[PDB]
Amino acid sequence: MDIILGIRVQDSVILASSKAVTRGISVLKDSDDKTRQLSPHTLMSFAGEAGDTVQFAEYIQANIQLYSIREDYELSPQAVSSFVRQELAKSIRSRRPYQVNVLIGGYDKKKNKPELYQIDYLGTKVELPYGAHGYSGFYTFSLLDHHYRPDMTTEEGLDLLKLCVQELEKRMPMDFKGVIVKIVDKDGIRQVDDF
Amino acid sequence: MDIILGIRVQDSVILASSKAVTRGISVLKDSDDKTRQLSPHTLMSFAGEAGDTVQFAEYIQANIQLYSIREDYELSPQAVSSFVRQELAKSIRSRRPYQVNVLIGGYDKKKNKPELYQIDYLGTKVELPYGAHGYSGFYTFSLLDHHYRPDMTTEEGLDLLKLCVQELEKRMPMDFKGVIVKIVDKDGIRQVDDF
Amino acid sequence: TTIVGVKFNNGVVIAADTRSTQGPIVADKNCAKLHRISPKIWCAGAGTAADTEAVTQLIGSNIELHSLYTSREPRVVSALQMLKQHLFKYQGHIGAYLIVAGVDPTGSHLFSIHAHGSTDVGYYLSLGSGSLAAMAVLESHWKQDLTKEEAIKLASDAIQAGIWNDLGSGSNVDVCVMEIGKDAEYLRNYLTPNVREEKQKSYKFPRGTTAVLKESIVNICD
Amino acid sequence: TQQPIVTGTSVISMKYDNGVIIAADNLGSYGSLLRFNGVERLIPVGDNTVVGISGDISDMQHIERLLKDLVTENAYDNPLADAEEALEPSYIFEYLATVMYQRRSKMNPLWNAIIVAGVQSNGDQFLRYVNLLGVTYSSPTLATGFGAHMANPLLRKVVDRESDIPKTTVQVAEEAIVNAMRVLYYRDARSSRNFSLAIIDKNTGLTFKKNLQVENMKWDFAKDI
Amino acid sequence: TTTLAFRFQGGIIVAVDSRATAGNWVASQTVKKVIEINPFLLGTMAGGSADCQFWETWLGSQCRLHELREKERISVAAASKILSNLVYQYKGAGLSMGTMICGYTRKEGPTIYYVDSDGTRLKGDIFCVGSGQTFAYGVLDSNYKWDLSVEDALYLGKRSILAAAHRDAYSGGSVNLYHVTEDGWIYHGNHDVGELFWKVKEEEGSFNNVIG
Amino acid sequence: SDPSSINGGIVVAMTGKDCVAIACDLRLGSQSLGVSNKFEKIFHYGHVFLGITGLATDVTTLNEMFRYKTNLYKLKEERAIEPETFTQLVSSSLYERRFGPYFVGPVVAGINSKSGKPFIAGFDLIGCIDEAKDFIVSGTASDQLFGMCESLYEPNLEPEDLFETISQALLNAADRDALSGWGAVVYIIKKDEVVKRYLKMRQD
Amino acid sequence: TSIMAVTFKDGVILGADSRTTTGAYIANRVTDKLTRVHDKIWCCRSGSAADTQAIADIVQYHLELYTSQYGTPSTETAASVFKELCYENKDNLTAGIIVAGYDDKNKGEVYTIPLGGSVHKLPYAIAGSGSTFIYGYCDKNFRENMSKEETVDFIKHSLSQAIKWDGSSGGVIRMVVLTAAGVERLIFYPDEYEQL
Amino acid sequence: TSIMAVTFKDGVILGADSRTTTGAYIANRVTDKLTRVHDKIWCCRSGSAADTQAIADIVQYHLELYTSQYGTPSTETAASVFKELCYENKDNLTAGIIVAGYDDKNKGEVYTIPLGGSVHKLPYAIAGSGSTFIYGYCDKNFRENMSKEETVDFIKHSLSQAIKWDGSSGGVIRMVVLTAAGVERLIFYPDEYEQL
Amino acid sequence: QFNPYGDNGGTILGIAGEDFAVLAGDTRNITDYSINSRYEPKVFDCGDNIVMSANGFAADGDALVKRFKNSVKWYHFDHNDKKLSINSAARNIQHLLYGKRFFPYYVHTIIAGLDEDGKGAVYSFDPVGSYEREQCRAGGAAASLIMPFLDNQVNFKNQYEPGTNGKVKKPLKYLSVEEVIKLVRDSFTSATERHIQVGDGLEILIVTKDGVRKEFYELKRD
Ligand SMILES: *[C@@](C)(CO)[C@](*)(O)[C@H](Cc1ccccc1)NC(=O)[C@H](Cc1ccc(OC)cc1)NC(=O)[C@H](C)NC(=O)CN1CCOCC1
Ligand SMILES: *[C@@](C)(CO)[C@](*)(O)[C@H](Cc1ccccc1)NC(=O)[C@H](Cc1ccc(OC)cc1)NC(=O)[C@H](C)NC(=O)CN1CCOCC1
Ligand SMILES: *[C@@](C)(CO)[C@](*)(O)[C@H](Cc1ccccc1)NC(=O)[C@H](Cc1ccc(OC)cc1)NC(=O)[C@H](C)NC(=O)CN1CCOCC1
Ligand SMILES: *[C@@](C)(CO)[C@](*)(O)[C@H](Cc1ccccc1)NC(=O)[C@H](Cc1ccc(OC)cc1)NC(=O)[C@H](C)NC(=O)CN1CCOCC1
Ligand SMILES: [Mg+2]
Ligand SMILES: [Mg+2]
Ligand SMILES: [Mg+2]
C-alpha cells in the first residue's frame, strides 16, 4: 500500500494507485491493483494496514453488488460513499478497527457528473476535485492547486496526473513501482495500460 | 546513506555507493558521493547516522593525509584499515559514539594486490572478496556467493556489480537513486561516469 | 466550584457559586449548580459538570416516580441512598460531589456525597475546589441554634470566601432555603458582587467593514 | 532532588497598623506520624525580624544556622551592628530568597516555604514569602501550606487591601491570627494544638509568645451526629 | 516554516514565509526568516526560532572575523561549514535548525548549501526546508527549468511559498523574496499572503479548490 | 493524537436584537495538512441551527443523527422542534455516550418560534449545557474567540451590526490558530428570514 | 482511623475516633465510624469510607432479612456475612472491619476482618492506621472480665494514644456499650482525653 | 530494628534488640546495635547496617581526633557530627541514629537523628521499625528522674513489646548504662522478657 | 521528583504609539487555585527609558529582570554612561535567555520604550531568546485571548474600507495614548472575565521622551 491519488475533471474521475506491495526489506509484488469496482460506474481505491485493506474493499464490494441485484439499480456515487463512510465510522469504535483509507471515484449517470470522495479510516468524508491519501498529499495537493483547472479533459487530467507521479518518483523516499491508472466516466470504468 | 557495496577482483577493488540523501519524506539529494579518498590508492565509502558519516570520513581523511605529508609515503590499505578500526573501537565506548559503517578499498603497491576491508561502527574489521553494509548485504552476499570468481577482470566485476544494483532496485523498499561506482587499482582511483 | 450547606432552626439552606471552568478558562459565568431533585429536596453539585447534572436528574426522575408510587412526599434519605448506590456502582468514574439537603415528613436534613459513594452527615458542610475557603468561614462563625436569616448570611459568606479566594469559583451566589412547613424558595443570583464595569469603548463596526464573497437566502420552511 | 522527611505545616501572618504578626505550630510531622511536639518554627533574627519556616525540618535547621551565622558576620568590623547597620528584615529576606533560587537552579532545593516578617528601620512593615522554587511575593496577609487555603480567606476579611492596614489594631489582628490557628487545628491533619506567635511592633518591639494553645473550641454538636 | 532557494541561469532565488508557531498557536505573522550575513551571503531559517536566530547571527560574526583576518570575503562553503561544525558539536543536545547558506563568490559562483541540526551539509541546486517543504517542492519541481528568466524565477519562488503557505497549517503570513547575482543579493519585497493569494488566484486562474 | 485537534475548526454564536448569528470556518485538515476548504460545520433542522466543532467524523455522524432524531420528532409531534428542546436532546444524546464520547463541541442557535426569544447554547463533549445571553464559542481557537467576543460584543445589536461583530470575532480568532480558517460562513437569523454569507479571509 | 472493640464481664464495647481524611485535609471531624447492622450487633469501620459503607449497608440488609425468617442472628453469623463480602470482593475493596455483638448465650464477642477477608475471633481487637501505635499499650493493659468502667477507661486511654500519634486520627472518641441492659452511646471530647 | 535511649536521675541508658534481617531471613540474631563512639558517648543504630556502621566509624574517628586536640567532647558535639554526615549525605543514606552520652555537667542527654538528618534533643527517644508499636506504651509509662532499676524495667518492658509485634526485631535485649560510675553492659534473654 | 518550574499566572501587554509606548500587566500572582498576592507588580522600569516584564514563572521572571537591570548598570560602567538603546537591550536580552537554552527561563518577555528616532518600540521574546520588534504584543496566560483583539484594533486586521468591495484595506495609523489606554483597559477586563489567573489590579507603565509614568486600575477580584 501507500500511494493512492484521485483527480476529478470535466467528464471523468481518474484514480492512480501504486503497484508496490512491500513487507520488511522486500518488495513482494510490483503489479498490485489497489482497487475494486463497486458498481459499473463506481470505483474504490484503498490503502492502509495489511489484510484490512482488501478485506474491507471486498466486503464493501459484496454489499454494493448485493444492493445492485436486489434493486436492479445502481447506487449513486454519493450514496455509496455515504454507505462506506458509515461502515468506517462504526469500525473506528470497534474492538479492532479497519485501518483503511479510501478514495471513491464515480460517475453519477442521473446528474451526468464525475464525483470524487476522500474517506479516511476514521470515517471522515469529503468531496474533492482532487484527493490523495498518506504522504502523497504533501506533494500532490500543492502541485494540483497550481496546475488543476475544473474544465480539463480526460487527456489533460492524465498529463496532470503524470506530473504528480513524476514529482512523487523524484521526492518520495520509497520505490512504489509506478501506478495503475483507471478512468471512470459515462461509459464506465477502463484501465490505461501504458503509464 | 544506506547502500554501500564493495567487490575485490583480480587487479582492482570496485566500490558502489548510493546517491540518495533522504530525510523524512523528502529525497533532498540524488547525486551524493558517499566516499573519500584517503590516499592516492585508498578509497573509503561510508554509511550511517547523519552528520557522523561525513564528519568521521573527513577526520580519517585528514589524519591519513597528515601521515602522507609527514613520512612522504603512502600507508598500505591494511595499515589504514587498522587505523580506522581503532578509531571506531575507541568511539564505541565514548560518551557519543560515531555511528558509521565503512568499506575501505585499496591497492597495495608493495604487494601489487587489491584489498577490501569491511568495518562496522563497533570496530569490527574483516578482509573480504566482496562486502556490503546495511540491508544490502541480505541480497548481494548470496548473489555474489553464486556469481563471483576470484580471477575476474574489472569489466567482469562491473557486470557483476550491475547484477547487484539491478537486484537491489528490484527488491529494496526505498529508492536509493542509483550508485556512484569507483575503481581502485595500480593506477589509482577513477570514477565510472555512466552507470 | 464552591458549594455549602447550613442547617438552622426550622430547616436547611444550601448555596453555591456560579462559575464553570475548562482548565484556566471560564466557560460559563452564570451557571446553575443548585439542582431540584424534588420540590423540597435540592442538591448542590461540584465536580464534573455533566455528571452532577445527569445524576441529579436521573435520581430526581426516579424519586418522582417513587413519590407517585408510594403516595408520599419523598425523603432526603431516599435521594441519599439512591445517589450513593449509583455513584458507588461506577467506582468514582461519575465525578459528582454533591451536597444533598431538604425537608420531608421526617424533618430537615443535610448530607454530602462523594464521587466514590461515601456519605456524611453534618450541621454545616462544604464541597468543591473552594471548600477550604468556605469551611474556614463556617468553622469560624457557625453556631448551634441559627435562625433562618443568620444561616443564609453564614452560607452566602462561606460561598463568598470561595468566590474571592478560590480561582475555581467566582461570579454570583445562588441560594436555596428549605424550611419545614413552607415552600422551598430558590434564590437565583441572590448576590451579584461581580458585575462587569462599563467598557471604555464601543467596538461597533461601520457597516461594510467585513469583506463578503457570496450571499444567499436560506430556506427554513417546508 | 529531595523528598521531605520531618515536616512542619502552615505558617500564617499579617500586617497591622504598627507592625506584623506571625504564627506557626510546634509540630514536627514524620509523614502521618505526629513525631515531635517541641519544635520551634519561628526564629527571631535580632529584635526586628522573625522568620517563619514550614516544610522539611532538617532544611529548616540548616536555615537557622545560616541566619545565626549571618548575625555573627554582620557584627564583624561593624560598630553600628546594634544601630544603623543592624540586620533589616529586607536584607535577611533577600539573602534567603537568593539562596532558595540558587538551590532550585542546582536541582537540590531547600524544601521549605518561608515567611519573613519584620519592621524596617524607617517603621515600615515588612512581610514577604519565599519557597523551595525561589518564588517570592508580598501581600497584607501571607500563609503557607493549608494556611494559604484556610487562613488567608479569614485574614483577608480583616485586611483586604493596603488601605485596611492603618485601620487594623494589634488586638484585632492577633485575634484573627489566633482564630485562624484554631481553624487549622480543626481541619489540618498535620497540625498540633500547641503553637508559637510573634508580634513585631514599631513601638513595643519584638514580643515572642511560646506555648500558646488553641482554645474555645466547638465540639459539643458532635453528640447529635 | 517553508523556505526554499534554487540556482538558475540568472543566479539564485531565495524565498521564505514569515510565520512563527508555538504548537497550534500562531505566535507571529511578520518574522524575518532570511538573515543578510553580508552583501553577498544569505542565510535561511527553519526550525527552532531562537536556535536559528541566535546561531545564524553568530555565524555572521564569524564571517566578519574571517574577512578581517584574511582580507577576503568568506566562501559560501567555508561559511556553511562553520555553522555545520558548530551544530555538530551540539549534536544530541536538542538543537532544531534547517538552514540554507546562499551566496555568490568569484571562485565558487552562485552556491547553495543545506545545513541542518543533525550535522548534514549538502551542496545543491534546489532545496526546500521546513514543515511545508513538500508543498513548495511540488510546485517548484514541476515548473523548474535552468533557463528561467529573472522575472519568471522570482515568481516561481514566490508562488512555491504561496502554495505551501496555503496548504501547510504551520506556514504563512507573507513571502520574503531575494535574488542573488554576481553583484550581491537584491531584496524583492515582502508580499502578504492575504492579498497575494487572491491576486494570484484571479490572474493565474489557479487555486480552484478554494471558494472564489 | 488528541481527537479534538486533528481536523481543526471553530464555531461561534451571538445574540442580537430579535436575532441570532452563528458562524463557522471551512477548514478540514489532517493535522498540518489542509485537505478541504469546503467543510461546513453548521447544520439546521427546521429553524434550529446546530454548529459542531471537533473530530470531523463525529461532526458528520452527529449531524446525521440529529437529522434522524428531529425528523422523527416532527412526524410524531407534528411541529418543528424548538431550540430549548433541541438543546436538551443534544445533551441527552451526548451523555448517553458518557464513557465513549463523541469528540465534539456543539453549539445550538435559533429563535423560539412561539415566544420570539433569541436562544443560544453550548456543550462540552459529554453533554453539559452552557446557556448564555451573549455568546457561545467552540473549537481549536476557543481561547481566541473568548477574547474576541468578550471585548467586541455589546447587547442588542441590529442584524447588520451583529454580522460585522461576529464576523470580526471569527476572522481575527481564526488567523491566530493554525488549524482554523481557510474560509468562513456566517448565518444571520431573524424570526422568518435567514441570510447566509461567505466571508473573504486570508487563505493560509 | 483508630478503632477498637473490647469484650468484658457484662458484654462488649466498641470504640472509634471521628476523623475522616482526604489526604491531609480533614473532610469530617465528627464522623460516626460505629455503625449498627443489628439491634445488638455493631461494627467499627476502617479503610475506604465508600467501601465500608456499602458493605455495612448490604450486611444490614442481609441481617434484617435473616431476622424476618430465622429470628435474631448470632454475632458469628454477622461476621460471616461481612467476611463473605470482603473475601469475595478482595480485589475491589479496601475495608478493615471489626464486628462486635452481644448474645445472651455467648455474651460479648469480637470478630476482626482485615483486608484479605479472613476472620479472627478475639477477646479484643484494634484496627485502622492509628492502631499500630497502641499494640504495645493495649497488650500490656488488657485484662479479661473487666468491669464497664475499667473497659471504658481502657478504650479511652488507648484511643487517646492512637489519636495523639496518628495524624489520620482525631476529633471525639465515640463508644457504644453492648450489654443485656441495652445499647448505650458514649462520647468523649478532646479537653478530657488529650490530658490523660 | 527496635532501639531506644532513656535519660534518668544518674545518667542515661541505651537499649536495643539484636536482630539483623535480609528480607524475612535473620542474618544475625545476636547483633550489637549499641556502639561506642566515645568513652561515655554511645549510639543506637537503625536502618541500613552498612550505612550506620560507616557513619559510626567516621564519627568515632572525628571524636578521637577532637579529644586529641580539645579534650572530651560534649554529647551535643557528637550528635552534631552525626547530623553533619546524615544531613549532607541524605540522598545516599538510610540511617536512623539515636545518640546518647553522659557529661558530669549536663548529666544524661539523648539526641535522635531521623532519616532527613534533623537533630532533636529529647528526655527519651525510640526508633527503628519496632518503635511504632510502643509510642503509646512509652508515652504513658515514661517519667523524668527515674531510678536505674525503674529505667531498666521501662526499657525492658518497652523493647519486649516492640520485639513481640515487630518481625524485624527480636533476639536478646542489650542495654548500656551511662553514669558517673562508668559504663555497664546488660543483656536480657527471651526466657525472661517474653513472659513480662 | 522535584519539578523546578511553576506557573504564577497573570498576563502582560505592550503597545507602541508614534512618540510613546505602554507596557501593561495585571498585579495578580497565583499558584494552582490560590491567590498569593493581589498586588505583586511584574512590570519594571529598568532605566534608560526601558520598561520590562517577564511573565510566566515569577522566580525566573524576577531573576531575568534582575540580571537585565544589572546588565544596564554595567553597560554604563563599561561604555562611559552611554544610553542603552531599545534595540541593543533587545539583543542583550536574547543572550541572557539563550544562555540558559538547555534549562530555560520559563517566561514570555516583553520590553517597551523608544527607538533611536524617538518612535515607540515594543520587542517580544520567546523563553529561549528569539525576538522581534512589533507594534503590538500580549504575553502570558491570557495572551491567546488578548492578542487577536489587538490584531483587530491596533493593526486593523480583517477590517476593510466600507463600500470598497473588500478591495481597499483600512489604512494603518498610529494611536493616541488616550486610545491605547482604552484598549489596554478593555483587553484586561475582557481577559479578567474569561481567565481565572487574571484579575485584582492593572498597572500600566507609559514611556515617553519625558520619562516613565504609571497608572493603576482596579480589576475584578474573583
Ligand atoms: C468548579 C467551578 C470547578 O473547579 C465546579 O466543580 C464545577 C461544577 C459545576 C457543576 C455544574 C455546572 C457547572 C459547573 N466544575 C466544572 O466546571 C468542571 C471542572 C472540571 C473539569 C474537568 C474535570 O475532570 C478532569 C473535573 C472537573 N468543568 C466541566 O465539567 C466542563 C464544563 N467540562 C469539561 O471540562 C469536560 N471534561 C469533563 C470530564 O471529562 C473530560 C472532559
Ligand atoms: C515553521 C513556522 C514551523 O514551525 C518554521 O519552522 C519556524 C521557523 C522560524 C525561524 C526563525 C524565526 C521564527 C520561526 N519555526 C518556528 O516558528 C518554531 C517552531 C518550533 C518550535 C519548537 C521547536 O522545538 C525544538 C522547534 C520548532 N517556533 C518556535 O521556536 C517558538 C516561537 N518558540 C518555542 O516554541 C519556544 N520553545 C523552543 C524550543 O525550546 C523550548 C522553548
Ligand atoms: C482513617 C481516617 C484512615 O484509615 C480511617 O480508616 C477512615 C475510616 C472511615 C472514614 C469515614 C467513615 C467511616 C470510616 N478512612 C478514611 O477517612 C478514608 C481514607 C482512605 C481513603 C481511601 C482508601 O483506599 C482506597 C483508604 C483510606 N477516607 C475516604 O474514604 C475519603 C472520604 N475519600 C477519599 O479519600 C477519596 N479517595 C477515594 C478512594 O480512592 C482514593 C481517594
Ligand atoms: C531493623 C532490623 C530493621 O530496620 C534495624 O533497623 C537494623 C539495624 C541494624 C542492623 C545491623 C546492625 C546495626 C543496626 N537494620 C537491618 O537489619 C538492615 C535492614 C535494612 C536494610 C536496608 C535498608 O535500606 C537500604 C534498610 C534496612 N539489614 C541490612 O542492612 C542487611 C545486613 N543487608 C541487607 O538487607 C542488604 N540490603 C543492602 C541495602 O539494600 C537492600 C539490600
Ligand atoms: Mg476566585
Ligand atoms: Mg497555512
Ligand atoms: Mg519477633
Side-chain angles (χ1 to χ4, degrees), chain H residues 158-170:
Chain H
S158 295
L159 296 182
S160 169
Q161 286 306 125
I163 282 166
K164 181 176 182 167
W165 296 114
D166 188 29
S168 313
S169 301

PDB file of all heavy atoms in Angstrom, chain H residues 158-170:
ATOM      1  N   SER H 158       9.398  -2.076  77.336  1.00  0.00           N
ATOM      2  CA  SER H 158       9.154  -1.402  76.066  1.00  0.00           C
ATOM      3  C   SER H 158       9.656  -2.241  74.898  1.00  0.00           C
ATOM      4  O   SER H 158       8.884  -2.603  74.014  1.00  0.00           O
ATOM      5  CB  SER H 158       9.821  -0.027  76.047  1.00  0.00           C
ATOM      6  OG  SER H 158       9.236   0.834  77.008  1.00  0.00           O
ATOM      7  N   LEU H 159      10.947  -2.560  74.904  1.00  0.00           N
ATOM      8  CA  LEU H 159      11.541  -3.368  73.836  1.00  0.00           C
ATOM      9  C   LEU H 159      10.944  -4.775  73.762  1.00  0.00           C
ATOM     10  O   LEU H 159      10.909  -5.375  72.690  1.00  0.00           O
ATOM     11  CB  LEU H 159      13.062  -3.452  73.993  1.00  0.00           C
ATOM     12  CG  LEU H 159      13.844  -2.141  73.870  1.00  0.00           C
ATOM     13  CD1 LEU H 159      15.332  -2.415  74.013  1.00  0.00           C
ATOM     14  CD2 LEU H 159      13.569  -1.422  72.556  1.00  0.00           C
ATOM     15  N   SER H 160      10.480  -5.294  74.897  1.00  0.00           N
ATOM     16  CA  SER H 160       9.756  -6.566  74.926  1.00  0.00           C
ATOM     17  C   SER H 160       8.521  -6.511  74.027  1.00  0.00           C
ATOM     18  O   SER H 160       8.273  -7.431  73.248  1.00  0.00           O
ATOM     19  CB  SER H 160       9.340  -6.919  76.357  1.00  0.00           C
ATOM     20  OG  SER H 160       8.434  -8.006  76.378  1.00  0.00           O
ATOM     21  N   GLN H 161       7.755  -5.429  74.140  1.00  0.00           N
ATOM     22  CA  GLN H 161       6.563  -5.234  73.310  1.00  0.00           C
ATOM     23  C   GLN H 161       6.925  -4.977  71.849  1.00  0.00           C
ATOM     24  O   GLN H 161       6.313  -5.551  70.948  1.00  0.00           O
ATOM     25  CB  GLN H 161       5.706  -4.079  73.843  1.00  0.00           C
ATOM     26  CG  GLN H 161       4.934  -4.414  75.109  1.00  0.00           C
ATOM     27  CD  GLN H 161       4.078  -5.661  74.972  1.00  0.00           C
ATOM     28  OE1 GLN H 161       4.190  -6.591  75.768  1.00  0.00           O
ATOM     29  NE2 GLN H 161       3.233  -5.694  73.951  1.00  0.00           N
ATOM     30  N   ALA H 162       7.915  -4.117  71.623  1.00  0.00           N
ATOM     31  CA  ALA H 162       8.405  -3.846  70.273  1.00  0.00           C
ATOM     32  C   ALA H 162       8.806  -5.146  69.579  1.00  0.00           C
ATOM     33  O   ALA H 162       8.401  -5.401  68.446  1.00  0.00           O
ATOM     34  CB  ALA H 162       9.582  -2.885  70.317  1.00  0.00           C
ATOM     35  N   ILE H 163       9.586  -5.966  70.279  1.00  0.00           N
ATOM     36  CA  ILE H 163      10.024  -7.270  69.771  1.00  0.00           C
ATOM     37  C   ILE H 163       8.850  -8.214  69.494  1.00  0.00           C
ATOM     38  O   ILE H 163       8.848  -8.933  68.492  1.00  0.00           O
ATOM     39  CB  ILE H 163      11.018  -7.935  70.754  1.00  0.00           C
ATOM     40  CG1 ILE H 163      12.399  -7.289  70.600  1.00  0.00           C
ATOM     41  CG2 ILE H 163      11.106  -9.441  70.525  1.00  0.00           C
ATOM     42  CD1 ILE H 163      13.369  -7.606  71.718  1.00  0.00           C
ATOM     43  N   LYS H 164       7.864  -8.205  70.385  1.00  0.00           N
ATOM     44  CA  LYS H 164       6.715  -9.107  70.284  1.00  0.00           C
ATOM     45  C   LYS H 164       5.912  -8.895  69.008  1.00  0.00           C
ATOM     46  O   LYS H 164       5.439  -9.857  68.406  1.00  0.00           O
ATOM     47  CB  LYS H 164       5.789  -8.931  71.490  1.00  0.00           C
ATOM     48  CG  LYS H 164       4.586  -9.859  71.476  1.00  0.00           C
ATOM     49  CD  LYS H 164       3.751  -9.735  72.735  1.00  0.00           C
ATOM     50  CE  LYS H 164       2.588 -10.713  72.704  1.00  0.00           C
ATOM     51  NZ  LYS H 164       1.924 -10.847  74.030  1.00  0.00           N
ATOM     52  N   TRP H 165       5.754  -7.635  68.608  1.00  0.00           N
ATOM     53  CA  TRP H 165       4.926  -7.282  67.456  1.00  0.00           C
ATOM     54  C   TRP H 165       5.724  -7.158  66.164  1.00  0.00           C
ATOM     55  O   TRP H 165       5.258  -7.579  65.110  1.00  0.00           O
ATOM     56  CB  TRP H 165       4.164  -5.987  67.730  1.00  0.00           C
ATOM     57  CG  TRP H 165       3.199  -6.123  68.861  1.00  0.00           C
ATOM     58  CD1 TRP H 165       3.250  -5.488  70.065  1.00  0.00           C
ATOM     59  CD2 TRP H 165       2.045  -6.971  68.903  1.00  0.00           C
ATOM     60  NE1 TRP H 165       2.194  -5.879  70.852  1.00  0.00           N
ATOM     61  CE2 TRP H 165       1.438  -6.789  70.161  1.00  0.00           C
ATOM     62  CE3 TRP H 165       1.461  -7.862  67.996  1.00  0.00           C
ATOM     63  CZ2 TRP H 165       0.278  -7.463  70.538  1.00  0.00           C
ATOM     64  CZ3 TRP H 165       0.307  -8.535  68.372  1.00  0.00           C
ATOM     65  CH2 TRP H 165      -0.271  -8.331  69.631  1.00  0.00           C
ATOM     66  N   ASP H 166       6.918  -6.577  66.248  1.00  0.00           N
ATOM     67  CA  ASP H 166       7.761  -6.388  65.068  1.00  0.00           C
ATOM     68  C   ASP H 166       8.500  -7.675  64.708  1.00  0.00           C
ATOM     69  O   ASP H 166       9.230  -8.232  65.528  1.00  0.00           O
ATOM     70  CB  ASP H 166       8.769  -5.258  65.302  1.00  0.00           C
ATOM     71  CG  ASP H 166       9.535  -4.877  64.043  1.00  0.00           C
ATOM     72  OD1 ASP H 166       8.991  -5.040  62.927  1.00  0.00           O
ATOM     73  OD2 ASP H 166      10.684  -4.402  64.170  1.00  0.00           O
ATOM     74  N   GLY H 167       8.298  -8.142  63.478  1.00  0.00           N
ATOM     75  CA  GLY H 167       9.012  -9.304  62.957  1.00  0.00           C
ATOM     76  C   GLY H 167      10.469  -8.991  62.672  1.00  0.00           C
ATOM     77  O   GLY H 167      11.329  -9.869  62.745  1.00  0.00           O
ATOM     78  N   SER H 168      10.746  -7.728  62.352  1.00  0.00           N
ATOM     79  CA  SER H 168      12.110  -7.269  62.099  1.00  0.00           C
ATOM     80  C   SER H 168      12.926  -7.100  63.383  1.00  0.00           C
ATOM     81  O   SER H 168      14.092  -6.725  63.322  1.00  0.00           O
ATOM     82  CB  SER H 168      12.087  -5.945  61.328  1.00  0.00           C
ATOM     83  OG  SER H 168      11.191  -6.010  60.232  1.00  0.00           O
ATOM     84  N   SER H 169      12.321  -7.369  64.539  1.00  0.00           N
ATOM     85  CA  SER H 169      13.009  -7.243  65.822  1.00  0.00           C
ATOM     86  C   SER H 169      12.913  -8.525  66.634  1.00  0.00           C
ATOM     87  O   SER H 169      11.944  -9.276  66.518  1.00  0.00           O
ATOM     88  CB  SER H 169      12.420  -6.088  66.625  1.00  0.00           C
ATOM     89  OG  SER H 169      12.529  -4.874  65.907  1.00  0.00           O
ATOM     90  N   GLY H 170      13.922  -8.764  67.462  1.00  0.00           N
ATOM     91  CA  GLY H 170      13.979  -9.976  68.267  1.00  0.00           C
ATOM     92  C   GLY H 170      15.359 -10.273  68.811  1.00  0.00           C
ATOM     93  O   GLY H 170      16.234  -9.408  68.830  1.00  0.00           O
TER      94      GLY H 170
END
